[PDB]
């Protein structure tokens, strides 16, 4: 529904420039905890859909942003079974298993610790997205190196440095 | 010479608070290119000597900062053989070999590309420090994992994720 998305775009694009900036997108997003939507997550989302290195999305690009965030909301709403604004370790295990990840139970505690900005041992919507984006990017890199598909990689000193340099 | 360092500390500590902030240290440092001293390098240096998580150094901690930066200046001044403000690949090879690193010729191009903010294919003083801090930290992690000291490591999927999570 382009007519619906256009009216949304106009309300988010507060400076009426035709480009939604990081700050404009952040102000339009709720993370369900009454704190600012994780600005790293916002930057990740804008960068994924901005095809012009302009630190923002135009209307065509925003239609993708809106579907992306809506799809994420639908996943999170499914697994936040108590409507608390955060999913717990068991719910995170189910959600990531639904994406196809193969992760030990104990690694889910590591993931929550790494990405939960609230510090309560559960994970809110904005931090959930960011953790999943990172997990996909890191797993993609591992899949490239694991050419024998055994779950293990072997790398030299300089291969390891180059691998880290590709990450950060 | 505490009397000399005290007078330096007073001039850098512009707000006269007894704590030199990141911004105060940055304003006191020249990177020899007439651009602001790399703020990542400044943050790395403050964090290394601040024992109190106060985003700054007191006078005792600053005596360490001053010796640290002075030691780095002495290394860089040695190898900037044309007094240009930047060292080239050959000079970088010598400097890092002097620190004990074992790096192929081609990896020095990778290092320069990764850390040279000026974009000229050489490396200035502030970027040199930051690259060396990162190289030490990453090599330290590799040394921990390379228990057979052969220059190769083998890691599982979850070991790799945990390793990356320790880096960034
Ligand atoms: Mg705008
Ligand atoms: Mg919940
Ligand atoms: Mg393998
Ligand atoms: Mg001060
Ligand atoms: Mg030079
Ligand atoms: Mg080994």
A-B CB pairs within 8 A amount to 66
Q: Does B137 touch chain A (CB under 8 A)?
A: no
Query: What is the three-class DSSP state of A48?
Result: helix
Identify the domain containing residue B17 by its residue range: 1-168
Query: What is the three-class DSSP state of A150?
Result: coil
Residue A37 main-chain phi, psi, to 5 deg: -55, 130
Residue pair A108/A79 in contact (Cβ under 8 Å)? The answer is no
CB neighbour list of residue A135: distance below 8 Å, 6 or more residues apart:
A96, A101, A111, B161
Residue pair A43/A22 in contact (Cβ under 8 Å)? The answer is yes
- Measured CA distances, A109 to A82, A93, B106 (Å): 20, 10, 40
Chain B hits for A150, Cβ within 8 Å: none
Residue A144, Cβ density class (10 Å: 0-12 exposed, 13-18 middle, ≥19 buried): exposed
CA of A160 to the centre of ligand 6 (A): 12
| B97 labeled part of a ligand binding site | no
The pair of structure tokens assigned to B167 is 């880096």
Q: Does B136 touch chain A (CB under 8 A)?
A: no
Q: Does B149 touch chain A (CB under 8 A)?
A: no
Rounded to an integer, what distance in angstroms lies between the CA atom of residue B65 and that of residue B166?
25
**A113-117: long-range pairs with CB below 8 Å, 24+:** A114/B165, A117/A35, A117/A38
Strands A86-87 and A56-57, how do they pair? unpaired
SS (H, E, C) chain B: CHHHHHHHHHHHCCCCCCCEEHHHHHHHCCCCCCCCCCHHHHHHHHHHHCCCCCCEECHHHHHHHHHHHHHHHHHHHHHCCCCCCEECHHHHHHHHHHCCCCCCHHHHHHHHHHHCCCCCCCEEHHHHHHHHHHHHHHHHHHHHHCCCCCCEEEEEHHHHHHHHHCCC
Residue pair A25/A49 in contact (Cβ under 8 Å)? The answer is no
Query: What is the three-class DSSP state of A143?
Result: helix
Residue B65, Cβ density class (10 Å: 0-12 exposed, 13-18 middle, ≥19 buried): buried
CA of B123 to the centre of ligand 5 (A): 9
* A103, A153, A167 member nearest B168 (Cβ): A167
Breaks (C-N over 2.5 A) in chain B follow: none
> How many Cβ atoms from other residues are within 10 Å of residue B115's Cβ?
23
Residue of B nearest to A115 (CA): B165
Rounded to an integer, what distance in angstroms lies between the CA atom of residue A45 and that of residue A22?
9
Q: Which residue has the tokens 């072997």?
A: A154
Beta pairing partners, A156: B152
* A139, A142, A160 member nearest B142 (Cβ): A160
- B155–A158 CB contact, under 8 Å: no
* Closest C-alpha to B167, from B132, B126, B139: B139
Residue pair A8/A66 in contact (Cβ under 8 Å)? The answer is yes
* Closest C-alpha to A35, from A43, A44, A26: A26
CA distance B2 to chain A (A): 40
* B114, B142, B161 member nearest A165 (Cβ): B114
CB neighbour list of residue A103: distance below 8 Å, 6 or more residues apart:
A93, A96, A97, A111, B158
Beta pairing partners, B86: B124
CA dihedral A153, A159, A160, A165 (to 10 degrees): -130
Resolution in A: 1.7
- Measured CA distances, B128 to A60, B97, B111, B137, B154 (Å): 42, 14, 10, 14, 30
CB neighbour list of residue A164: distance below 8 Å, 6 or more residues apart:
B138, B164, B167
Residue pair A69/A30 in contact (Cβ under 8 Å)? The answer is no
Q: Does B162 touch chain A (CB under 8 A)?
A: yes
Residue pair B93/B108 in contact (Cβ under 8 Å)? The answer is yes
Rounded to an integer, what distance in angstroms lies between the CA atom of residue A84 and that of residue A128?
14
Q: What's B60's domain CATH number? A: 1.10.238.10
* Closest C-alpha to A124, from A88, A98, A81: A88
* A138, A152, A156 member nearest B151 (Cβ): A156
Chain A hits for B133, Cβ within 8 Å: none
| Structural domains counted in chain A | 1
Residue A154 main-chain phi, psi, to 5 deg: -125, 125
**Ligand positioned closest to the Cα atom of A89:** 2
Rounded to an integer, what distance in angstroms lies between the CA atom of residue A125 and that of residue A30?
9
Rounded to an integer, what distance in angstroms lies between the CA atom of residue B50 and that of residue B65?
9
> How many Cβ atoms from other residues are within 10 Å of residue A99's Cβ?
11
Q: How was this structure determined?
A: X-ray
Q: Does B164 touch chain A (CB under 8 A)?
A: yes
Q: How many CA atoms lie within 13 A of B142 on its CB side?
A: 23
Residue of A nearest to B103 (CA): A158
Beta pairing partners, A124: A86
- A161–B138 CB contact, under 8 Å: yes
């Amino acid at each position: 529904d382009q007519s619906f998305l256009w009216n949304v775009f106009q309300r988010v694009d507060k400076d009426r420039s035709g480009v939604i900036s990081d700050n404009e997108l952040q102000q339009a997003l709720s993370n369900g905890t009454w704190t600012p939507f994780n600005p790293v997550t916002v930057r990740s989302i804008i960068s994924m859909f901005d095809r012009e290195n302009k630190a923002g999305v135009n209307f065509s690009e925003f239609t993708g942003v809106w579907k992306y965030i809506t799809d994420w909301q639908n996943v999170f709403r499914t697994y936040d079974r108590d409507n608390s604004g955060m999913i717990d370790k068991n719910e995170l295990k189910q959600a990531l298993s639904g994406f196809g990840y193969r992760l030990s139970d104990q690694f889910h505690d590591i993931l929550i610790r790494k990405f939960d900005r609230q510090g309560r041992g559960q994970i809110a919507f904005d931090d959930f997205i960011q953790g999943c984006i990172v997990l996909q990017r890191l797993t993609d890199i591992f899949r490239r190196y694991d050419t024998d598909q055994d779950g293990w990689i072997q790398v030299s000193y300089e291969q390891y440095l180059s691998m880290v340099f590709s990450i950060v």
